[PDB]
Design a protein around this nucleic acid. Sequence first.
DNA 1: TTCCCACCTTTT
DNA 2: GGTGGG
Length: 1609
Amino acid sequence: VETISTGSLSLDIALGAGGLPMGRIVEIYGPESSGKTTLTLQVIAAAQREGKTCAFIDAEHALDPIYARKLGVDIDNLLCSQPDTGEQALEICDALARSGAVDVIVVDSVAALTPKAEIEGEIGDSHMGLAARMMSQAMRKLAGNLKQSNTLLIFINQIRMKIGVMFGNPETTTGGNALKFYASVRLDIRRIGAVKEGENVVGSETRVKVVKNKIAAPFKQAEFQILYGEGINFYGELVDLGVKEKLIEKAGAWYSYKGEKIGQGKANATAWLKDNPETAKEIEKKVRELLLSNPNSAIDENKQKALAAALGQIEKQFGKGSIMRLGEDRSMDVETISTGSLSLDIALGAGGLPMGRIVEIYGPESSGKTTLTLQVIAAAQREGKTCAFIDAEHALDPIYARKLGVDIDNLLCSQPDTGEQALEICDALARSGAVDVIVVDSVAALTPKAEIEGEIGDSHMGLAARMMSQAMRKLAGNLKQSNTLLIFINQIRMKIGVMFGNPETTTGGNALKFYASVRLDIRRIGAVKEGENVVGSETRVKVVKNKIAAPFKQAEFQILYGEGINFYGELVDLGVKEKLIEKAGAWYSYKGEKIGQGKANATAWLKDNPETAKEIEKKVRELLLSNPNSAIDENKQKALAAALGQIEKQFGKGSIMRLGEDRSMDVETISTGSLSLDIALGAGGLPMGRIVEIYGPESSGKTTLTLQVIAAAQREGKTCAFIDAEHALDPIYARKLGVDIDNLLCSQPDTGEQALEICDALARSGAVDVIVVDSVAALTPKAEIEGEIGDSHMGLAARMMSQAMRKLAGNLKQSNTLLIFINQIRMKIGVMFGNPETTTGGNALKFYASVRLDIRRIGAVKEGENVVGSETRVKVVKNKIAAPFKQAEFQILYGEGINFYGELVDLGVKEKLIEKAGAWYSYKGEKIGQGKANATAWLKDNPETAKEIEKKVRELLLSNPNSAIDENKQKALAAALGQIEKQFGKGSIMRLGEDRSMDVETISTGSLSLDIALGAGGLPMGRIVEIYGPESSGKTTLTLQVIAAAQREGKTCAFIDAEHALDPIYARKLGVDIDNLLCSQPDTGEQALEICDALARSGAVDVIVVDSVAALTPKAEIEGEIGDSHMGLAARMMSQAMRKLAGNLKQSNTLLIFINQIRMKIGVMFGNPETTTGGNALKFYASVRLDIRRIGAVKEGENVVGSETRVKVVKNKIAAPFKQAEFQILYGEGINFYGELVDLGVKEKLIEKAGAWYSYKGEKIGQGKANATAWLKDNPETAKEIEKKVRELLLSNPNSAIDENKQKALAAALGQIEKQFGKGSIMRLGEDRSMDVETISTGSLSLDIALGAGGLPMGRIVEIYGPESSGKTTLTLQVIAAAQREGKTCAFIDAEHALDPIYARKLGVDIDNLLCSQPDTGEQALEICDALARSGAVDVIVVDSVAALTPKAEIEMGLAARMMSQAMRKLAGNLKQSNTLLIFINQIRNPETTTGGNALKFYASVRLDIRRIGAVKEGENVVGSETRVKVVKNKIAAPFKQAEFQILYGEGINFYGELVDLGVKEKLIEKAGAWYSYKGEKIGQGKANATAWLKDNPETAKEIEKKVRELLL
DNA sequence: TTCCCACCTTTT
DNA sequence: GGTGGG
Ligand SMILES: Nc1ncnc2c1ncn2[C@@H]1O[C@H](COP(=O)(O)OP(=O)(O)O)[C@@H](O)[C@H]1O
Ligand SMILES: Nc1ncnc2c1ncn2[C@@H]1O[C@H](COP(=O)(O)OP(=O)(O)O)[C@@H](O)[C@H]1O
Ligand SMILES: Nc1ncnc2c1ncn2[C@@H]1O[C@H](COP(=O)(O)OP(=O)(O)O)[C@@H](O)[C@H]1O
Ligand SMILES: Nc1ncnc2c1ncn2[C@@H]1O[C@H](COP(=O)(O)OP(=O)(O)O)[C@@H](O)[C@H]1O
Ligand SMILES: Nc1ncnc2c1ncn2[C@@H]1O[C@H](COP(=O)(O)OP(=O)(O)O)[C@@H](O)[C@H]1O
Ligand code: ALF
Ligand code: ALF
Ligand code: ALF
Ligand code: ALF
Ligand code: ALF
Ligand SMILES: [Mg+2]
Ligand SMILES: [Mg+2]
Ligand SMILES: [Mg+2]
Ligand SMILES: [Mg+2]
Ligand SMILES: [Mg+2]
């Protein structure tokens, strides 16, 4: 074995034998620009340095001779071939091997070794295994010839990814398995970092692994530097290796060799070794001796004789210049084209993009990819070059291309059907030699033929990637031989499951990374502003890959809309920077002469003096370019027309043509229904044949706007389709907005795939003009719908959307069909910069959309009292059709639509077309109205005049003006509708007007005034509704009332009590049929929602209510610990639930009500700080949102007998929103319905009110509202009559064998649920025993009375708060004492660290059995609670001071609050199932509050406010505290009762004291002044003595107590 | 023979 | 920050 140096010392060491072995095969593989070629050339250079002959087979067609020379290759003697086929490449190798005249041969990219059959055949031809088999054959033939000639053969390989592998690593190597085996050495090279010069990236930090070794031990590795333009930093290695081996001294920064100092810092030491090559050889020799594991140990004139013989043989076999010396190959010289940006041409090093090469530009949407592309075309055309544009993205605007200076009439342009076609066209143009630059707009849009013919949702694993990989092989060679530049535009996708590096990627696999000679990363970094206006994009381009000059330089410039790249702007900045232009403050001078003030003017001067500009530019280039550069056309046209004819004959009629004459490329628009929007849009409306996205917050106007464009389109005989994936379209409201319902095609699809397949069908039909998809958010993938709630479908919807765009874009353009996508907003999480908002369904749509609209409600349109509309603002966030970032403000008047004529007035007045004299509006002298209201009405009245004013406004304000047959359309329409219905079932698509299941049907809420506020007379069936509000506001109560009303009409209802606080007995009091109310107390939130879905699907339940989304605890959270972080889990779960539920609920006509709690959002000064639990999904999906609030107390002189209540209709999809209802909730009774009826009746003059006397139709019905209400209860027939009339008068939106099948399906679902979620996961409320409320004495009798139910409830959470030393702990201990007295087990969590065991004993606590913990962190405290709760072994737990519950992070902005909120979710369920009472003591921080957030207020079933009100005195001594407890919240009985008692220090609650007072109050004990008597017998004088008597007679005390309880409980 | 792709807040 | 499947 004999070796050759690799050019890297550390590699030669890693290789064991000191280099690569002669007569063997070697493979080097790695990622793009990793250093494969560079390393290769370095070994050649080293070999040539020793008189060896080398050959380079550049199959990759990317070798730069000048750079090879820079790396020290002798160009003039390096044999070099650029073969056509892979077989040719390998046949050349074999010939050179056999000749015995060549010492080292390298083949650059086996990846590029394209089989002959592949090159002859089309791109998209099944050459399965062909290249592998060829490689396998090559090895067999080569191995022997190489050994006998002692010729080293190096193969460079690229990396591909193996797909659907599940072990090791997914990387592979092109060209089969043969090479792995035959290689004696395999090298894995990788770039691991950048070599920096402060600012500059001057090299690549490199690592090579020896992956296979037949020559020495494998798996050693080498790290070194590749310095651009220099090569492997060899002396750098020598320094590091020398220092490591103690041959070179290193004293801090000082490097010494044998006493003599050689340099300071590695940089200088390296330079010294360059300077002393003799000393370098010496150190190197020693390093090798020390570190090489395997020791190495007339003639040449015969070689040349055989060399020339082989070269002659090769050329005679494979044509003219099939092999030659690199230095003399002219066709190898790198020639460049300007990019249109000067600073980019500088960044590129060589002054532009290289001819005959492939280039890729990628970046985010609207970053400038197309614009830049067109600019290079423009520049190329400016120099007589022919260019082609492949618009696969179907979004090129010819008029805009012209504005950028493209010669439209000579720009070849194609809009291909399939990706294969697109690339076959490229290959044809490449081969023709007639086109100079070709650009392909979006590889992302290069849709494989099979994908187009397949359905949406079909899986085509790696197809596009494999197609791209094939294209590169075929193109690379053809492009080089024709000297044709090919630019690929790519989009960015996000890769998922990546924490290191950056998550961005590029469409269409890995092939392009490798084949590209230049890769550009373009990004918009800011706006170019004109005070008000956004007139351009500030732009930055990074040179990410460069084979032509040093990479990683960058260029910043301006893209001025409608103008292009600001070239002269660059020239000014570059000129000033290079001291060619003088800058004295704001004054710019050139050679003494002043040229302008401010960059703006200096730029204008250079436009004016193009001769001077050329001069400055030339000098800037000379100064700053690192790689400077230095009958016929009639043959070209002959070959051009030949290719164009060939293409058209292959791919149909107008598959390729000149842009200027392509009619189907002209942009045509549709009105949006808003005039100011049409102006903002620049071109006067949305573009036909394009994709458009509208996004915004809930109820912002997305659907409304959508419908308005449909209405306008129908007004002009266009056919429209509406895909209501959100399942919330109201046909009657659509009609009100002027939509022709009877002709509006409408679909309510099951899956997202179905929705998009329908779009594609309608697109292809050519019969529909505008399609709108309502909510991509609601486009639920098929796998998700069939899967469970909580199932993970990573990137499924995104990948589905990405597929849809590919398929749709083309079909939409060819049919001239506009497609509008409505999207919702989600919050992205973990983002401090920019804004946290996003859009559902991935990144594809951002790119494909030609227009993106951000719509927002900015205010209310008021009618003094009434909210009659939404003040609206739309921003044009993306625009491919005109300049972006203009905005439109208008009004959406409910039930009417966009106020178009309102806009017309304002725009008319603004443009001085309409006169405004104060309040008087005049048009052409004639007065048209007073106040904007009337002027608007006048324009409605004079539509002819309106058209006239509109036309003028548009002329004045639009930048970008625009302006037998139908029987064929219907033929194709019916064909598509038939096809759709046969594919997706019975009524998958139909005309809106005839869809019955679309009609809105309502249920009474139990409040009349609410039913009125709701507009349509109640909540809508088959829809989702949300009620939110503060604690004890009436959310559950209201909920139960709707159930009660629904049951009253034979409807089946289910209650999901996730909050674990439903009192069956109270539900009965509210009139709920307990025995038939289905009821579940679910463990996890996923379970809760899976139950909903099951009941929805069953079609057997009519109304389902979920009590507290707040309490819907995700499974992972429940199984996790308290303090565990579950970022966005509940939100994401809710978001998933809505997608799955919406559809099932509509098809079953099931109403679903969600109760939500309020949390406070933090860091908010504007608006209001309130929010709702469980993310953003519900806001959007809810058809109605109710804000309920307690506004006062209903009093009975003394007693608080009810809550005065107000409900606001915060969102309404069913009628006008923002109406409100006030009513009374009478405790134990419910909503006072007849009370409302009286007030509404009197208000509507149906009931007479003469002072206090209420009359109905002459007959007096009662005195005072109280009696009138009672009369209506008594006469239900008359009540119905009055109610019916009130509804007729006040509802703005009025309504419209069998049941045995239902029960069959009901029992089926209940069985299914129980088999899925265990024993009693769902049952009838009336028979659920674990639902019964059971109580514990508080130790105070009067408190047990105040509490209504006689004590605190088991399995519930309770809070006691009050000032310091008020008796919180004492009371707590008293309940424990009482509980222990009855054999219950208790735990005390003393987080406050202040419990006195001896005092607890004095209060009668059994100390020895009281479990007690003093926790370190708050999380620990609550985790202990949860453990005890789950154990089912503890009966009462008390936590002393939530205030003292210190978060773990703190004992190292609302951190305790979030922890408490989490605790409640986890505890509530565990406590109920164990029947464990949990008491929280809280401190106080009216201005009073409670520590630890808002969660506890809600979850507590009882809240106690305890206070010391006085001292119990013994003349001198203070022997106790006089105490008062208020019942502030009560879910178990009526609230707001209070208890006063004594806390006697060292004794506890003065129980017998209470007994005296209660006894006297109830006339059981006589009180004659100071004398207390019981049953005639005197028991004491003064309360003090009477108390002592009852202690003495415990038997009598029991008797009195029993009676007091009977009387007062 | 060779990838594709995000989703979501939470709390004074 | 935890979540894979065609
Ligand atoms: N002509 C050139 N001028 C300057 N730098 C170059 C040139 N060609 C390659 N490089 C640099 O060398 C490194 C590896 O290049 P190369 O060996 O061609 O990678 P590979 O062949 O592995 O794709 C890259 O960082 C690249 O920027
Ligand atoms: N027809 C047009 N009129 C005005 N400005 C446009 C037009 N088309 C594109 N632009 C602007 O040029 C910039 C880049 O557009 P484009 O090159 O199409 O981006 P990409 O193709 O990279 O998605 C954007 O700021 C965009 O608003
Ligand atoms: N059927 C209806 N009757 C009256 N007003 C409605 C109706 N539907 C929607 N609105 C009102 O129009 C505005 C926007 O409605 P919509 O277009 O449905 O919002 P989005 O679709 O953006 O969620 C809201 O303020 C809403 O209350
Ligand atoms: N079992 C009950 N007995 C008496 N009053 C009750 C009962 N449950 C609730 N209330 C009262 O009804 C009002 C609303 O209670 P509820 O509907 O539970 O509120 P939330 O909105 O928190 O669910 C409160 O004043 C509450 O005290
Ligand atoms: N160990 C004790 N000995 C005597 N008096 C006590 C003792 N502990 C508490 N008290 C008295 O009882 C009353 C309330 O105490 P406590 O229940 O601990 O208040 P807090 O509401 O702060 O927990 C106070 O007036 C206090 O002085
Ligand atoms: F193999 Al290369 F740039 F030459 F990725
Ligand atoms: F690639 Al684009 F707007 F054309 F993002
Ligand atoms: F998108 Al919506 F109400 F229809 F927020
Ligand atoms: F939601 Al509640 F009391 F039931 F605040
Ligand atoms: F003394 Al305290 F809560 F104020 F125990
Ligand atoms: Mg290479
Ligand atoms: Mg584009
Ligand atoms: Mg909507
Ligand atoms: Mg409740
Ligand atoms: Mg205390």
